[PDB]
């Protein structure tokens, strides 16, 4: 099976890429696996595969850390993401995001049901497993539980059967047969949970599949539209129908090659302690436990020599940055274009802790609009901050065509030099806020409302007659022939490789 369609093949691909370190000596899931992975993520090192996890039994489980994190070299910086999607390992972020958006104006390719797959190689009924006995990691020293679920896909379906959602949401072990996790608005797992609660008749049928097809975990992390079944979007994106197998205890369908599957129910009535957790913005607030959603696990199925992927998330750079931020930015780009806004590109700078999105404007189109900063900022902010794709993002930075939004240094330059504080900004207090940002949920104002801004880093003539400056840089401040002379004589004179 190809790497983008099968997690076990993905792991092979990382090895072949010389992007994997296999650790075959015993490693403790209590902090050690996650500490190694954290260091990987902070240094852009090779992904760790923990083949000898203390507490591994019944063949459950090995751990792969840092599945979607960055590589050290510039040339293949996003290679691990490219391997989720069948792209060359040198693919740019623009190419990765374009691939993730490609299915948005394609017919879905619905999944294909097959009778069995690797995920059925082993099973444990409700008399045979205990979640508290598995080698579930403690990821950060102050976490309120062992977070089994950091890179699996929750599967829930609307009561009417017409929408099956795949998404990542954290979850931790509660007891032998339950998890607790975050199920919050406006996320699709929450939206579907609310449909079942209003019906009021039963708990939500649920499955959680770990080690799914890489292209599927990417869509799981992207805010594709309400009512759109991720499986068909992934089928369109990859050009192939995904192969799914029915759960044993319910009628949901999971990827045939899933490493590990939990089957059970998400309660419409019960809750339990959840958190705290060391989160995407870089913090944990020890002791901040709150009631979360409660999942009951009835069955486990798994591959021989099952591998659990893990995100050791926090400060830069991990899956919460590379995937949450970039994939939200991609959806925002599309949203803007569909609302007739002249946006060419979007990206969530890592320097902003993925709380900003920079929007590159086609300023020729802007000029034809014959508008102003105040009007245009309001328009952009209303479109984005009133939509679910904008949920995680608190600052939008508008930039002109000279800025490469995928380069944080250039975004920070433009923000700092082209957007006058206050005057060139519009604050939004009556929009949904992201409570996980510390200044929201642990800040001075309402956790769930406001705190958003549109920062206009377009200069005045960009709305009227065109750019009226040149950069004071090597590229723009010197003629072509001179630049080339300097470059050609560089090492000859005494001054100091792409791949590396």
Ligand X SMILES: O=C(O)/C(F)=C/c1ccccc1
List contacts with ligand X (CB under 6 A): 170, 182, 277, 279-280, 313, 320, 324, 392, 436
456 binds K ion (CB under 5 A): yes
Q: Minimal CB distance to Mn ion: which residue?
A: 188
Catalytic residue among 243, 263, 274, 279: 279
Q: Kind and range of the H or E element at 94?
A: helix 93-101
Give residues in contact with ligand 4LU (CB under 6 A).
150-151, 165, 167-170, 182, 184, 187-189, 221-223, 311, 313, 319-320, 323-324
294 annotated ligand-binding residue: no
Judged by CB under 8 A, the chain residues 425 through 454 that form the site for a copy of itself are 425, 427, 429, 437-440, 442-445, 450-453
Task: CB nearer to ligand 4LU: give 192 or 411.
Answer: 192
Binding window for Mn ion (CB under 5 A); candidates: 27-35, 69-77, 183-191, 443-451: 183-191
Strand partners, 294: 180
CB 314 within 8 Å of CB 142? no
| Catalytic residue status for 279 | yes
DSSP state of 458: -
Kindly tell me which residue out of 315, 367, 448, 449 binds a copy of itself, with binding defined by CB under 8 A. 315
365 annotated ligand-binding residue: no
Burial code of 75-107, b = ≥16 C-beta within 10 A, e = fewer?
ebbbbbbbbbbbbebbbebeebbebbbebbeee
Minimum distance of ligand 4LU from residue 179's CB (angstroms): 12
403 annotated ligand-binding residue: no
CB 313 within 8 Å of CB 143? no
Minimum distance of K ion from residue 228's CB (angstroms): 9
Minimum distance of K ion from residue 425's CB (angstroms): 9
Kindly tell me which residue out of 12, 32, 121, 407 binds a copy of itself, with binding defined by CB under 8 A. 32
361 binds a copy of itself (CB under 8 A): no
Pairing of strands 47-50, 356-361: unpaired
337 annotated ligand-binding residue: no
C-alpha separations of 172 from 180, 293, 296, 480 in Å = 5, 11, 12, 58
Three-class DSSP category at 210: strand
Judged by CB under 5 A, the chain residues 417 through 446 that form the site for K ion are 424
Can you tell me which residue has the tokens 């060419």? 344
Can you tell me which residue has the tokens 């192939």? 240
Binding window for K ion (CB under 5 A); candidates: 37-45, 350-358, 391-399, 456-464: 456-464
The option from Mn ion, ligand 4LU, ligand X, none interacting with 5 (CB < 5 to 8 A, set by class) reads none
Q: Kind and range of the H or E element at 493?
A: helix 480-493
d(CA 490, CA 495): 6
d(CA 327, CA 100): 8
188 annotated ligand-binding residue: yes
Sequence-distant (≥ 6) Cβ neighbours of residue 162 within 8 angstroms: 227
Kindly tell me which residue out of 167, 187, 238, 265 binds K ion, with binding defined by CB under 5 A. 167
Tokens read off for 391? 């949920």
259 binds K ion (CB under 5 A): no
**Total residues belonging to the chain:** 500
CB 435 within 8 Å of CB 447? yes
168 annotated ligand-binding residue: yes
The option from a copy of itself, ligand X, ligand 4LU, none interacting with 319 (CB < 5 to 8 A, set by class) reads ligand 4LU
165 binds Mn ion (CB under 5 A): yes
d(CA 300, CA 127): 11
Question: Residues binding Mn ion: what is the number (CB under 5 A)?
Answer: 2
Using alpha carbons only, what angle is made at residue 477 by residues 484 and 492, rounded to the nearest 5 degrees? 30
The option from ligand X, K ion, a copy of itself, none interacting with 167 (CB < 5 to 8 A, set by class) reads K ion
348 binds a copy of itself (CB under 8 A): no
Pairing of strands 20-23, 47-50: parallel
Task: CB nearer to Mn ion: give 188 or 387.
Answer: 188
Phi-psi bin for 422: left (phi > 0), alpha (psi -120 to 50), beta?
left
Pick out the residues of the known binding site: 165-170, 187-188, 230, 388
Query: What residues line the site for K ion (CB under 5 A)?
Result: 167, 424, 456
Pick out the residues of the known binding site for Mn(2+): 165, 188, 230
Pick out the residues of the known binding site for prenylated FMN: 165-170, 187-188, 230, 388
Query: What residues line the site for Mn ion (CB under 5 A)?
Result: 165, 188
Positions annotated as catalytic residues are: 279
């Amino acid at each position: 099976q190809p790497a983008h369609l099968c997690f076990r093949s993905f792991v092979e691909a990382l090895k072949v890429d010389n992007d994997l370190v296999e650790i075959n000596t015993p490693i403790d899931p209590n902090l050690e696996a996650a500490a190694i992975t954290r260091r990987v993520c902070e240094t852009n090192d090779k992904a760790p595969l923990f083949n000898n996890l203390i507490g591994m039994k019944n063949g459950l489980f090995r751990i792969l850390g840092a599945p979607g994190s960055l590589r050290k070299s510039s040339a293949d910086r996003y290679g691990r993401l490219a391997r989720h999607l069948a792209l060359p390992p040198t693919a740019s972020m623009r190419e990765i995001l374009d691939k993730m958006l490609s299915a948005s104006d394609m017919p879905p390719i619905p999944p294909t049901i097959v009778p069995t797959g690797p995920c059925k190689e082993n099973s444990l009924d409700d008399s045979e497993f205990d979640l508290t006995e598995l080698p579930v990691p403690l990821i950060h020293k102050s976490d309120g539980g062992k977070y089994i679920q950091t890179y699996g896909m929750h599967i829930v379906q609307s009561p009417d059967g017409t929408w099956t959602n795949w998404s990542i949401a954290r979850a931790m072990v509660h007891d032998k047969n339950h998890l607790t996790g975050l199920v919050i608005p406006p996320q699709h797992i929450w939206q579907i949970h609310q449909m079942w609660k209003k019906e009021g008749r039963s708990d939500v049928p649920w499955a959680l599949a770990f080690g799914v097809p890489p292209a599927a975990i990417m869509a799981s992390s992207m805010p594709i539209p309400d009512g759109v079944t991720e499986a068909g979007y992934v089928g369109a994106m990859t050009g192939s129908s995904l192969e799914l197998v029915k759960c044993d205890t319910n009628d949901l369908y999971v990827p045939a090659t899933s490493e590990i599957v939990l089957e059970g129910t998400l309660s419409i009535s019960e809750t339990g302690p959840e958190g705290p957790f060391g989160e995407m913005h870089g913090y944990i607030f020890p002791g901040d436990t709150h009631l979360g959603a409660k999942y009951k696990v009835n069955r486990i199925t798994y591959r021989n020599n099952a591998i659990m992927p893990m995100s050791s998330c926090g400060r830069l750079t991990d899956e919460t940055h590379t995937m949450i931020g970039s994939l939200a930015a991609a959806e925002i780009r599309k949203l803007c274009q569909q609302n007739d806004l002249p946006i060419t590109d979007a990206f969530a700078p890592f320097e902003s802790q993925v709380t900003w999105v920079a929007l590159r404007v086609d300023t020729e189109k802007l000029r034809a609009m014959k508008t102003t900063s105040e009007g245009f900022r309001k328009r952009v902010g209303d479109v984005v901050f009133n939509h679910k794709a904008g949920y995680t993002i608190h600052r939008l930075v508008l930039v002109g065509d000279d800025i490469d939004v995928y380069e944080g240094k250039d975004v920070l330059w433009a923000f700092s030099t082209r957007c006058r504080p206050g005057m060139d900004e519009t604050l939004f207090e009556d929009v949904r806020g992201f409570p996980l940002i510390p200044y929201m949920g642990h800040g001075n104002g309402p956790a769930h409302r406001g705190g958003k801004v549109v920062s206009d880093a377009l200069m005045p003539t960009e709305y009227t007659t065109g750019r009226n400056w040149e950069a004071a840089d090597f590229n723009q401040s010197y003629p072509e022939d001179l630049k080339q002379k300097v470059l050609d004589n560089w090492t000859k004179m005494g001054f100091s490789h792409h791949h590396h």
